[PDB]
Design a protein around this ligand. Sequence first.
Ligand SMILES: *[C@@H]1O[C@H](CO)[C@@H](O[C@@H]2O[C@H](CO)[C@@H](O[C@@H]3O[C@H](CO[C@H]4O[C@H](CO[C@H]5O[C@H](CO)[C@@H](O)[C@H](O)[C@@H]5O)[C@@H](O)[C@H](O[C@H]5O[C@H](CO)[C@@H](O)[C@H](O)[C@@H]5O)[C@@H]4O)[C@@H](O)[C@H](O[C@H]4O[C@H](CO)[C@@H](O)[C@H](O)[C@@H]4O[C@H]4O[C@H](CO)[C@@H](O)[C@H](O)[C@@H]4O)[C@@H]3O)[C@H](O)[C@H]2NC(C)=O)[C@H](O)[C@H]1NC(C)=O
Ligand SMILES: *[C@@H]1O[C@H](CO)[C@@H](O[C@@H]2O[C@H](CO)[C@@H](O[C@@H]3O[C@H](CO[C@H]4O[C@H](CO)[C@@H](O)[C@H](O)[C@@H]4O)[C@@H](O)[C@H](O[C@H]4O[C@H](CO)[C@@H](O)[C@H](O)[C@@H]4O[C@H]4O[C@H](CO)[C@@H](O)[C@H](O)[C@@H]4O)[C@@H]3O)[C@H](O)[C@H]2NC(C)=O)[C@H](O)[C@H]1NC(C)=O
Ligand SMILES: *[C@@H]1O[C@H](CO)[C@@H](O[C@@H]2O[C@H](CO)[C@@H](O[C@@H]3O[C@H](CO)[C@@H](O)[C@H](O)[C@@H]3O)[C@H](O)[C@H]2NC(C)=O)[C@H](O)[C@H]1NC(C)=O
Ligand SMILES: *[C@@H]1O[C@H](CO)[C@@H](O[C@@H]2O[C@H](CO)[C@@H](O)[C@H](O)[C@H]2NC(C)=O)[C@H](O)[C@H]1NC(C)=O
Ligand SMILES: *[C@@H]1O[C@H](CO)[C@@H](O[C@@H]2O[C@H](CO)[C@@H](O)[C@H](O)[C@H]2NC(C)=O)[C@H](O)[C@H]1NC(C)=O
Ligand SMILES: *[C@@H]1O[C@H](CO)[C@@H](O[C@@H]2O[C@H](CO)[C@@H](O)[C@H](O)[C@H]2NC(C)=O)[C@H](O)[C@H]1NC(C)=O
Ligand SMILES: *[C@@H]1O[C@H](CO)[C@@H](O[C@@H]2O[C@H](CO)[C@@H](O)[C@H](O)[C@H]2NC(C)=O)[C@H](O)[C@H]1NC(C)=O
Ligand SMILES: *[C@@H]1O[C@H](CO)[C@@H](O[C@@H]2O[C@H](CO)[C@@H](O)[C@H](O)[C@H]2NC(C)=O)[C@H](O)[C@H]1NC(C)=O
Ligand SMILES: *[C@@H]1O[C@H](CO)[C@@H](O[C@@H]2O[C@H](CO)[C@@H](O)[C@H](O)[C@H]2NC(C)=O)[C@H](O)[C@H]1NC(C)=O
Ligand SMILES: *[C@@H]1O[C@H](CO)[C@@H](O[C@@H]2O[C@H](CO)[C@@H](O)[C@H](O)[C@H]2NC(C)=O)[C@H](O)[C@H]1NC(C)=O
Ligand SMILES: *[C@@H]1O[C@H](CO)[C@@H](O[C@@H]2O[C@H](CO)[C@@H](O)[C@H](O)[C@H]2NC(C)=O)[C@H](O)[C@H]1NC(C)=O
Ligand SMILES: *[C@@H]1O[C@H](CO)[C@@H](O[C@@H]2O[C@H](CO)[C@@H](O)[C@H](O)[C@H]2NC(C)=O)[C@H](O)[C@H]1NC(C)=O
Ligand SMILES: *[C@@H]1O[C@H](CO)[C@@H](O[C@@H]2O[C@H](CO)[C@@H](O)[C@H](O)[C@H]2NC(C)=O)[C@H](O)[C@H]1NC(C)=O
Ligand SMILES: *[C@@H]1O[C@H](CO)[C@@H](O[C@@H]2O[C@H](CO)[C@@H](O)[C@H](O)[C@H]2NC(C)=O)[C@H](O)[C@H]1NC(C)=O
Ligand SMILES: *[C@@H]1O[C@H](CO)[C@@H](O[C@@H]2O[C@H](CO)[C@@H](O)[C@H](O)[C@H]2NC(C)=O)[C@H](O)[C@H]1NC(C)=O
Ligand code: NAG
Ligand code: NAG
Ligand code: NAG
Ligand code: NAG
Ligand code: NAG
Ligand code: NAG
Ligand code: NAG
Lengths: 146, 146, 146, 107, 450, 53, 42, 123
Amino acid sequence: VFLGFLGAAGSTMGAASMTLTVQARNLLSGIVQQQSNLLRAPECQQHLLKLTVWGIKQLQARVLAVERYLRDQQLLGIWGCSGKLICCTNVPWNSSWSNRNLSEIWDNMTWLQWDKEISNYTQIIYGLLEESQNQQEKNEQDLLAL
Amino acid sequence: VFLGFLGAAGSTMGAASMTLTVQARNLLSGIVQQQSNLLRAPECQQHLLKLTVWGIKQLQARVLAVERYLRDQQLLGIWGCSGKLICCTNVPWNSSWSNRNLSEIWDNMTWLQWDKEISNYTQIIYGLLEESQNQQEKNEQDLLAL
Amino acid sequence: VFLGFLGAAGSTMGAASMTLTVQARNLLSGIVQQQSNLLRAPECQQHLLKLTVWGIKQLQARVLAVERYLRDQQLLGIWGCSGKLICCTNVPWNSSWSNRNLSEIWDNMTWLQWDKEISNYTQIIYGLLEESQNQQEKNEQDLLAL
Amino acid sequence: QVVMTQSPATLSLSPGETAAVSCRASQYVDRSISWYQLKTGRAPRLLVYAASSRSIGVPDRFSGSGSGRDFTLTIRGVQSDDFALYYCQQDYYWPVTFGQGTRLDMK
Amino acid sequence: AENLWVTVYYGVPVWKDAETTLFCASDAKAYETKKHNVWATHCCVPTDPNPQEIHLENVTEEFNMWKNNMVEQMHTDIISLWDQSLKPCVKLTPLCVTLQCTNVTNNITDDMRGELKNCSFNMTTELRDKKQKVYSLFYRLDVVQINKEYRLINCNTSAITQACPKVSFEPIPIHYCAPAGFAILKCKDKKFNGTGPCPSVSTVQCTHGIKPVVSTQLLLNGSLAEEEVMIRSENITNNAKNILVQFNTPVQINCTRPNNNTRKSIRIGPGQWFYATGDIIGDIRQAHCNVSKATWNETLGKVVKQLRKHFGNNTIIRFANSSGGDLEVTTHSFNCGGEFFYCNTSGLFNSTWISDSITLPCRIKQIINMWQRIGQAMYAPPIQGVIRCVSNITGLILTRDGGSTNSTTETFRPGGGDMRDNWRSELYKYKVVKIEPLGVAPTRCKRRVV
Amino acid sequence: EYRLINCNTSAITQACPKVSFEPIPIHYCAPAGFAILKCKDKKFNGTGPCPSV
Amino acid sequence: NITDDMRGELKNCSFNMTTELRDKKQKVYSLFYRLDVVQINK
Amino acid sequence: VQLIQSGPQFKTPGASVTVSCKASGYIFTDYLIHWVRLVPGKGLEWLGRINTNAGLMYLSHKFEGRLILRRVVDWRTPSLGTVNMELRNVRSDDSAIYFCGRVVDGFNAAGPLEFWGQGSPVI
Ligand SMILES: *[C@@H]1O[C@H](CO)[C@@H](O[C@@H]2O[C@H](CO)[C@@H](O[C@@H]3O[C@H](CO[C@H]4O[C@H](CO[C@H]5O[C@H](CO)[C@@H](O)[C@H](O)[C@@H]5O)[C@@H](O)[C@H](O[C@H]5O[C@H](CO)[C@@H](O)[C@H](O)[C@@H]5O)[C@@H]4O)[C@@H](O)[C@H](O[C@H]4O[C@H](CO)[C@@H](O)[C@H](O)[C@@H]4O[C@H]4O[C@H](CO)[C@@H](O)[C@H](O)[C@@H]4O)[C@@H]3O)[C@H](O)[C@H]2NC(C)=O)[C@H](O)[C@H]1NC(C)=O
Ligand SMILES: *[C@@H]1O[C@H](CO)[C@@H](O[C@@H]2O[C@H](CO)[C@@H](O[C@@H]3O[C@H](CO[C@H]4O[C@H](CO)[C@@H](O)[C@H](O)[C@@H]4O)[C@@H](O)[C@H](O[C@H]4O[C@H](CO)[C@@H](O)[C@H](O)[C@@H]4O[C@H]4O[C@H](CO)[C@@H](O)[C@H](O)[C@@H]4O)[C@@H]3O)[C@H](O)[C@H]2NC(C)=O)[C@H](O)[C@H]1NC(C)=O
Ligand SMILES: *[C@@H]1O[C@H](CO)[C@@H](O[C@@H]2O[C@H](CO)[C@@H](O[C@@H]3O[C@H](CO)[C@@H](O)[C@H](O)[C@@H]3O)[C@H](O)[C@H]2NC(C)=O)[C@H](O)[C@H]1NC(C)=O
Ligand SMILES: *[C@@H]1O[C@H](CO)[C@@H](O[C@@H]2O[C@H](CO)[C@@H](O)[C@H](O)[C@H]2NC(C)=O)[C@H](O)[C@H]1NC(C)=O
Ligand SMILES: *[C@@H]1O[C@H](CO)[C@@H](O[C@@H]2O[C@H](CO)[C@@H](O)[C@H](O)[C@H]2NC(C)=O)[C@H](O)[C@H]1NC(C)=O
Ligand SMILES: *[C@@H]1O[C@H](CO)[C@@H](O[C@@H]2O[C@H](CO)[C@@H](O)[C@H](O)[C@H]2NC(C)=O)[C@H](O)[C@H]1NC(C)=O
Ligand SMILES: *[C@@H]1O[C@H](CO)[C@@H](O[C@@H]2O[C@H](CO)[C@@H](O)[C@H](O)[C@H]2NC(C)=O)[C@H](O)[C@H]1NC(C)=O
Ligand SMILES: *[C@@H]1O[C@H](CO)[C@@H](O[C@@H]2O[C@H](CO)[C@@H](O)[C@H](O)[C@H]2NC(C)=O)[C@H](O)[C@H]1NC(C)=O
Ligand SMILES: *[C@@H]1O[C@H](CO)[C@@H](O[C@@H]2O[C@H](CO)[C@@H](O)[C@H](O)[C@H]2NC(C)=O)[C@H](O)[C@H]1NC(C)=O
Ligand SMILES: *[C@@H]1O[C@H](CO)[C@@H](O[C@@H]2O[C@H](CO)[C@@H](O)[C@H](O)[C@H]2NC(C)=O)[C@H](O)[C@H]1NC(C)=O
Ligand SMILES: *[C@@H]1O[C@H](CO)[C@@H](O[C@@H]2O[C@H](CO)[C@@H](O)[C@H](O)[C@H]2NC(C)=O)[C@H](O)[C@H]1NC(C)=O
Ligand SMILES: *[C@@H]1O[C@H](CO)[C@@H](O[C@@H]2O[C@H](CO)[C@@H](O)[C@H](O)[C@H]2NC(C)=O)[C@H](O)[C@H]1NC(C)=O
Ligand SMILES: *[C@@H]1O[C@H](CO)[C@@H](O[C@@H]2O[C@H](CO)[C@@H](O)[C@H](O)[C@H]2NC(C)=O)[C@H](O)[C@H]1NC(C)=O
Ligand SMILES: *[C@@H]1O[C@H](CO)[C@@H](O[C@@H]2O[C@H](CO)[C@@H](O)[C@H](O)[C@H]2NC(C)=O)[C@H](O)[C@H]1NC(C)=O
Ligand SMILES: *[C@@H]1O[C@H](CO)[C@@H](O[C@@H]2O[C@H](CO)[C@@H](O)[C@H](O)[C@H]2NC(C)=O)[C@H](O)[C@H]1NC(C)=O
Ligand SMILES: *[C@@H]1O[C@H](CO)[C@@H](O)[C@H](O)[C@H]1NC(C)=O
Ligand SMILES: *[C@@H]1O[C@H](CO)[C@@H](O)[C@H](O)[C@H]1NC(C)=O
Ligand SMILES: *[C@@H]1O[C@H](CO)[C@@H](O)[C@H](O)[C@H]1NC(C)=O
Ligand SMILES: *[C@@H]1O[C@H](CO)[C@@H](O)[C@H](O)[C@H]1NC(C)=O
Ligand SMILES: *[C@@H]1O[C@H](CO)[C@@H](O)[C@H](O)[C@H]1NC(C)=O
Ligand SMILES: *[C@@H]1O[C@H](CO)[C@@H](O)[C@H](O)[C@H]1NC(C)=O
Ligand SMILES: *[C@@H]1O[C@H](CO)[C@@H](O)[C@H](O)[C@H]1NC(C)=O
């Protein structure tokens, strides 16, 4: 855990796609989330009760990490990707959002650069992914299929 | 998000089944759960620390939304529906719980009316769904299958 | 719910594998997590606000149950088991971790005894399960498959 | 009470010579005898916990012996550092009692 | 060596010992209408709906009542609730002034001579330019003679607060309940001595109801042993450790505070009130407790019979009274009908075992230091009328002196010790464990890649 | 000779001179998982089966 | 025994302080640094 | 393990004298604490012992009406605590060096003393 947390950040999209579990494992487990799960009492805890302001700040940090995690999982569920780090969809690429070939982006761009190129199309793409899944379920409820 | 949140409430069960992502998206995202995830500090936060009672009420609301969400997801997992908004099971309908044909309920009833008709059979049905999944796993652990 | 919560604890691994939903259902639902979800206000709540230390202790207990649940679910997701109480993997057994035949462990050992026999190989096994899933995804991204 | 009597009242010897202190109980005390080394300006040092069994930190110059009523403190290569008072302590019946004590003098 | 693969299971019935925070709950029946009861307000979560208990066939588990973190937690939470309920009360700072005191001689019996002092003083008033002359009776144990001039004892070290007159510290039973993800295991063997490999274990949702009664020497209103008197200790041969003795039958004790007593309130400030003790109606006599004599004979015969199993069946066992330099180490301390009693038990622990009723005189106090703090003190308001409590003695706290003489005897005395020994007498059967649902094992299946 | 009225029963605090208790409008908002339903009928008397929600 | 560089640096102040028993007063004194006090109206 | 005693005292005959011993570095409860008086012209005399957990006093039968032992503990801090001594009706016969000491581990039912203080002394 955290042995190369953002190690692929400067690498290409292709190479970086091979380290996806590395970042996923660090979204729900900060130091305080490890101390909170010791078999022994952590001892510190009395401090956070005697002084309730510190107790509240710690809980807010823990609750937020959980809420952010769950929201990303909910979107993957809605889009039809329950689990999987990499999933294919039926939404075609518009070639307006970005107009580059596969041999250019997977080999020459980093994920940070990509993110800064299509950031204002994010909501359009997410909207289409949701519509696609709804259409798929409508087709599933037809026993003659395709 | 929230552009027709309960819009299908007065519609029939059939039509309403086509809007399921609309309600699902609003279970983990109230206004305070959006403000809490800004890149900038929300600014308000000092108020909730200076006066710890308000800080606690806000956390209780956030924790509860998460717990309710997770409990529903756990039941779907137990019943054998990981993900999916609509899933088929192997539990037969009893015709005691409700005794109507498909052409009557999917076209003439709303979900609110349905809920008020079979509410005291809810636990029986949930119990059967769990038993069904356990039986399925017992059959899966047999390499000769069916 | 909780009608035989650890009832299989003294039973064999084989028999105990048939009660897995029994323990799973009790990880997110303690008494306070039921009282918190009443349609009526619980009434007690004012106590936990007037005296903020008790309010904080209760939230810490609730947040922790959620964090522990989610971490186990994240590991199952990473290892390629989204949902399911029982899942097969591609990691071979080393026969160093434990060197017993199937007819000995499934019929004569309890899960507690097993846990005390291979506890210091837990991290090795978990590491291998993650590597296996990453290798599987690398193979999936090949349209000629196997 | 159980009275302890030490003998001789005094020892007279040179460093490198051996030394011993006898102690006798007026009543049977089994193995409940301990020994102390006293010097002016210092609290008593415990040398022996019970009968023959020596305390922690004490050098091999010391050991004890005896039982019931007849006890001895044994000192081997006596050092100039050992020219101290010695006391026999009874710890079987309550109150804890001490003998009169003995003294190790230089020639 | 079989060709097996790793199979992952979730929901496996496995656990580890763990420390955590229990949340407490109560039976919301009669206790629900108590309203101002401290325990009925805190342990708000309703429980005991015919609660579940699940027998675990073939589970043997290690228990150790002397290292049980549930007791330490109970102790800490009791202290915190007491401080929280006293924190918002009046704070009687203005009372530490010179008092002018004389003896109460008004129809006092011989045993009450010098016990009560009639003290007058100059108190502050609600309007801040006036003073008033007021008086109150005090118990001898609450005052210090200085230089007829007296002061309250707690002047050198602390302010004295006043318990709020409506707050009731009545020890109604409470239950400890595990948070989700944890479980409480209970040891069911009869004649379990507090440690080791208990072969009969069940899980519970919550503990049985426990009354948080605070006392010294004699444990009141606890549970009883199932079959025989039990003697438990961390180490029975070490005369430094306390021995907890659990009776298998109760001994009934009747405690009273005679003297009709009245109460008056005095404004000390703007809505700030002090409760004074007014003249006693009727005559003046000592508080006392009554223990049946035959019963407090039969039950010692049982204790001795069991002590012989550890000390020798040819050993003489004698009981003797407490000896020490304080009140808190020699008496039986308890709260009765709201007032604090310090009773003399030398009339009980006086016998030698070689193989009507007992009246215990008792003194009372209004200024209580509580627990083991040096600063912090509480004034217990007086209660009008007379007080009568009927309680069950369910166990003893005993210590040994050490060895004695060659006659081979042992002497036992009422002990002292930390308040935690009172909770160890009820929570000895419970252990808290963390549930760990993931595990792996060899099987013949292999993930089929599709 | 006079006294302030609140002497027999309580201390009197003082509102802080900079604190303004001006009733600016506020809105009540539902937490996630809950919703607020509004009755739109004109001439609604406070009770019963409101048909426009 | 003050050096030249300490002249006027320390003040020896006596005053009527409250006591633990609220009907008495006590006369006590403490040294203070010049920078901690204000001369008004010794 | 350290035992720290208070300094020397002088008292008017008939007055009481109180001395103390602060103990630290081992658990205060457990390990009985004993008091021994040293008279240069007579030898050592045991006065009594105290059970620091229970707060119980055991005395040599010479001093039952004269000597009181007390202890102070705080469950918060197990490694620290004190033992106090009060001796009433002090006379010139009581001129002595008063010592505090602790029993050898495993001997609470007895009284060999492994650790010692400094000696008050009194008059
Ligand atoms: C539960 O609590 C009890 C306490 O109540 C714990 O028991 C105690 O355990 C410690 C060990 O940790 C023992 O310490 C050792 O004692 C021996 C001496 O033992 C003999 O003499 C005893 C004298 O007692 C008298 O007084 C009592 C009280 O009034 C009377 O009742 C007696 O009758 C006597 O008059 C006697 O009691 C002993 O018998 C008892 O114990 C034996 C088992 O040991 C039983 O069989 C008997 O039936 C009976 O119950 C016995 O006759 C000392 O010699 C030891 O010192 C050596 O070892 C030390 C180790 O640290 C070392 O530092 C010393 O320097 C010394 O070393 C010597 O020996 C070494 C051997 O390896 C050599 O290498 C070394 O060079 C040197 O030569 C030690 O002090 C306590 O005695 C014992 N207390 C009691 C009361 O029994 C028990 O452990 C606790 N249990 C648990 C689970 O926690
Ligand atoms: C071991 O276990 C036993 C058994 O539970 C326990 O004994 C019981 O202790 C409680 C607490 O002291 C006793 O309860 C009190 O009883 C008196 C007497 O009432 C009798 O008469 C009425 C009819 O008039 C009957 O209904 C009743 O059953 C009795 O027969 C009551 O007067 C007490 O009420 C006052 O104090 C309460 C404090 O909690 C208040 O909540 C209540 O509102 C009352 O206060 C008000 O009135 C007062 C008088 O005017 C006034 O001074 C106050 O300011 C306020 O305005 C209370 O109910 C119970 O009877 C005992 N049971 C038995 C069999 O004796 C032991 O105490 C326990 N041992 C230990 C060590 O814990
Ligand atoms: C404690 O001391 C107070 C005094 O500080 C005692 O109260 C006093 O009692 C006397 C009678 O013994 C009262 O005097 C009489 O008053 C009546 C009128 O009520 C008058 O007719 C008689 O001739 C006589 O003067 C006195 O006023 C009263 N003082 C106060 C302040 O109440 C109190 O009784 C003592 N209590 C105890 C238990 O000792
Ligand atoms: C940082 O950039 C350099 C330069 O583009 C990367 O270097 C490549 O490394 C691979 C693996 O060793 C070689 O096969 C390539 O030929 C190298 N490129 C060039 C132009 O020589 C380096 O890998 C990048 N860092 C990371 C973490 O990806
Ligand atoms: C509210 O009820 C009306 C009446 O039943 C629904 O009207 C139907 O609308 C569909 C779509 O335009 C038509 O094909 C049907 O013929 C209409 N029904 C009738 C009887 O004329 C209306 O859709 C309902 N509202 C919602 C949200 O479903
Ligand atoms: C506790 O152990 C006993 C003894 O091993 C188990 O008894 C078996 O029960 C099954 C079902 O009734 C029988 O078919 C076996 O023949 C019994 N075994 C023997 C040796 O007779 C008992 O089931 C175990 N408890 C649990 C919960 O599994
Ligand atoms: C209340 O205060 C008054 C003074 O305001 C005390 O009365 C004086 O006491 C002193 C001795 O301390 C005498 O020398 C005065 O002559 C007394 N004056 C009067 C008018 O009597 C009074 O004793 C105080 N009361 C109490 C109960 O302490
Ligand atoms: C409770 O009873 C157990 C036995 O059931 C005691 O444990 C044994 O004690 C003897 C010595 O008397 C040892 O030889 C055994 O090896 C111990 N057995 C085990 C499993 O530990 C235990 O000491 C008793 N507890 C108390 C406080 O008296
Ligand atoms: C404890 O027992 C004594 C008897 O020894 C009780 O005192 C008696 O009470 C009755 C009724 O008031 C009187 O008639 C007797 O004269 C009293 N006897 C004596 C010797 O005083 C006492 O009431 C009992 N205490 C409790 C709490 O019940
Ligand atoms: C404690 O008080 C109870 C009363 O509450 C006493 O019990 C009564 O005893 C008499 C005989 O003297 C019987 O006639 C009554 O029927 C009993 N009453 C009840 C309710 O049981 C009890 O004896 C007293 N205990 C002591 C030690 O004095
Ligand atoms: C323990 O019991 C003894 C009696 O066996 C009490 O001894 C009496 O103490 C008083 C002073 O408190 C003396 O006036 C008596 O003369 C003593 N009696 C005898 C026979 O000498 C001792 O006080 C009791 N201890 C406690 C704490 O109550
Ligand atoms: C505790 O109670 C006992 C028994 O009543 C008291 O011992 C008696 O005290 C009186 C003096 O009030 C003596 O005349 C008796 O001779 C004593 N009895 C015995 C057997 O010696 C004891 O004093 C009380 N304890 C305290 C601290 O007051
Ligand atoms: C402890 O028990 C003894 C008896 O073993 C009590 O002493 C007796 O008291 C009666 C009066 O009730 C006298 O007639 C006897 O002569 C006394 N006998 C002896 C040997 O002294 C003693 O009072 C009891 N102690 C307490 C505190 O009650
Ligand atoms: C003293 O103990 C007795 C015996 O346990 C208690 O009386 C029993 O209480 C239970 C309820 O917990 C009832 O089911 C039994 O029927 C009662 N038995 C009898 C013979 O009445 C008694 O309540 C206890 N006293 C106190 C003050 O707690
Ligand atoms: C403490 O208070 C006393 C008065 O209670 C002060 O002494 C008086 O001071 C005034 C001037 O302010 C003189 O006129 C009086 O004659 C003094 N009276 C006496 C008895 O000396 C005293 O100065 C104050 N002390 C301090 C250090 O401020
Ligand atoms: C949309 O993103 C592109 C990225 O190349 C940027 O140049 C453009 O200014 C963005 N549009 C707006 C309105 O910010
Ligand atoms: C069960 O539900 C039906 C719905 O039609 C209702 O009429 C009936 O009264 C309910 N039963 C009970 C016991 O409430
Ligand atoms: C590893 O587990 C085995 C279980 O049989 C145990 O015997 C061994 O001591 C453990 N290794 C270490 C270093 O604790
Ligand atoms: C008042 O108490 C003292 C002891 O403090 C006593 O000497 C005096 O005689 C008592 N006076 C009366 C009247 O009882
Ligand atoms: C502290 O208490 C003692 C009595 O133990 C008393 O003599 C002394 O005067 C008190 N201290 C103060 C400042 O009043
Ligand atoms: C208590 O039991 C002993 C047993 O030896 C007996 O001698 C004594 O008389 C009994 N006491 C009473 C009051 O029955
Ligand atoms: C005390 O300080 C003042 C200045 O505030 C100075 O004028 C005066 O001379 C000093 N007195 C002495 C004795 O130093």
